Design a protein around this motif. Structure first.
Motif, PDB file in Angstrom:
ATOM      1  N   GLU A  11       0.856  -1.235   0.000  1.00  0.00           N
ATOM      2  CA  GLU A  11       0.000   0.000   0.000  1.00  0.00           C
ATOM      3  C   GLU A  11       0.874   1.261   0.000  1.00  0.00           C
ATOM      4  OE1 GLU A  11      -3.852  -0.436   0.523  1.00  0.00           O
ATOM      5  OE2 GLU A  11      -3.023   0.772  -1.057  1.00  0.00           O
TER       6      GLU A  11
ATOM      7  N   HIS B 265       4.482   2.283  -3.465  1.00  0.00           N
ATOM      8  CA  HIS B 265       4.575   3.249  -4.597  1.00  0.00           C
ATOM      9  C   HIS B 265       5.221   4.556  -4.126  1.00  0.00           C
ATOM     10  CE1 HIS B 265       1.284   0.479  -5.683  1.00  0.00           C
ATOM     11  NE2 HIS B 265       1.930   0.462  -6.852  1.00  0.00           N
ATOM     12  N   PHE B 266       4.743   5.115  -3.048  1.00  0.00           N
ATOM     13  CA  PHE B 266       5.324   6.396  -2.553  1.00  0.00           C
ATOM     14  C   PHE B 266       6.765   6.171  -2.087  1.00  0.00           C
ATOM     15  CE2 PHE B 266       0.770   7.172  -2.219  1.00  0.00           C
ATOM     16  CZ  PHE B 266       0.724   8.389  -2.909  1.00  0.00           C
TER      17      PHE B 266
ATOM     18  N   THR C  88       3.612   9.077   4.905  1.00  0.00           N
ATOM     19  CA  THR C  88       3.246   9.975   3.775  1.00  0.00           C
ATOM     20  C   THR C  88       3.868  11.352   4.014  1.00  0.00           C
ATOM     21  OG1 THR C  88       1.135   8.814   3.733  1.00  0.00           O
ATOM     22  CG2 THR C  88       1.332  10.814   2.401  1.00  0.00           C
TER      23      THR C  88
ATOM     24  N   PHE D 152       5.759  17.063   0.115  1.00  0.00           N
ATOM     25  CA  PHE D 152       5.361  16.047  -0.898  1.00  0.00           C
ATOM     26  C   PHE D 152       4.716  16.761  -2.089  1.00  0.00           C
ATOM     27  CE2 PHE D 152       1.262  16.792   1.058  1.00  0.00           C
ATOM     28  CZ  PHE D 152       1.654  17.094   2.368  1.00  0.00           C
TER      29      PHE D 152
ATOM     30  N   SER E  81      -2.929   0.928  -6.633  1.00  0.00           N
ATOM     31  CA  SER E  81      -4.217   0.342  -6.164  1.00  0.00           C
ATOM     32  C   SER E  81      -5.258   1.453  -6.033  1.00  0.00           C
ATOM     33  CB  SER E  81      -4.010  -0.327  -4.805  1.00  0.00           C
ATOM     34  OG  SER E  81      -4.130   0.650  -3.779  1.00  0.00           O
TER      35      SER E  81
ATOM     36  N   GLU F 202      -4.180   4.154  -3.594  1.00  0.00           N
ATOM     37  CA  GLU F 202      -3.192   5.168  -4.062  1.00  0.00           C
ATOM     38  C   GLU F 202      -3.937   6.299  -4.776  1.00  0.00           C
ATOM     39  OE1 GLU F 202      -2.189   3.025  -2.242  1.00  0.00           O
ATOM     40  OE2 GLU F 202      -1.946   1.566  -3.808  1.00  0.00           O
TER      41      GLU F 202
ATOM     42  N   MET G 260      -5.068   8.387  -2.238  1.00  0.00           N
ATOM     43  CA  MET G 260      -3.977   9.018  -1.443  1.00  0.00           C
ATOM     44  C   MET G 260      -3.544  10.303  -2.159  1.00  0.00           C
ATOM     45  SD  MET G 260      -2.696   7.715   1.376  1.00  0.00           S
ATOM     46  CE  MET G 260      -2.126   8.988   2.530  1.00  0.00           C
TER      47      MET G 260
ATOM     48  N   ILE H   4      -3.964  14.919  -1.375  1.00  0.00           N
ATOM     49  CA  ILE H   4      -3.037  16.049  -1.656  1.00  0.00           C
ATOM     50  C   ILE H   4      -3.720  16.989  -2.649  1.00  0.00           C
ATOM     51  CG2 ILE H   4      -0.812  16.675  -2.604  1.00  0.00           C
ATOM     52  CD1 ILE H   4       0.075  13.820  -1.972  1.00  0.00           C
TER      53      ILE H   4
END
Lengths: 92, 92
Positions: free
Chosen positions: A40, A43-44, A82, A88, B2, B5, B8, B12
């Motif tokens: 989960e 990716h980041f 995150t 970010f 997924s 994401e 997520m 932002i």
């Protein structure tokens, strides 16, 4: 109804997808929570820099010290990882 | 990649939408943060029960005591209010 709400419900959608086999209790263990980070937050993982912040997370999870991690602890560990990537917004 | 994401990054997307006029700093004030709750958590307000949990939130925000609330404080206050509805999975 805003785009955010759509994603707020999604979070529940995916948190329940993993815990839909029984959901009898409402607690998550660190050992299974970590595995969720591997599929989960993988990716980041590329857009990170304070590697020392994530390093303490993997040690904080392994140091659950509570025997069981609730969902409130998952929304926090998910934020630090995150937010670990300072600024970010600067996605590049 | 997924479905999570996708959401997520959305978080932002919307957090930046409000702070896109300058984004010079990376801090949010409680007075403006509250207004975000009025247009971002107004939908879930119907699916809540521990009214006393939300009551302490509106008092915790007003009691920022820090002069400035960062994004980490927004992901936490957003969780308590969302988790405030014990067993949110039971949507009915």
């Amino acid at each position: 109804m805003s785009e955010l709400e759509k994603a707020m419900v999604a979070l529940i959608d995916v948190f329940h997808q993993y815990s839909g086999r029984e959901g009898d209790k409402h607690k998550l263990k660190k050992s299974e929570l970590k595995e969720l980070i591997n599929n989960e937050l993988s990716h980041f993982l590329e857009e990170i820099k304070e590697q020392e912040v994530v390093d303490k997370v993997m040690e904080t999870l392994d140091e659950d010290g509570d025997g069981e991690c609730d969902f409130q602890e998952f929304m926090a560990f998910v934020s630090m990882v995150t937010t670990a990537c300072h600024e970010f917004f600067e996605h590049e």
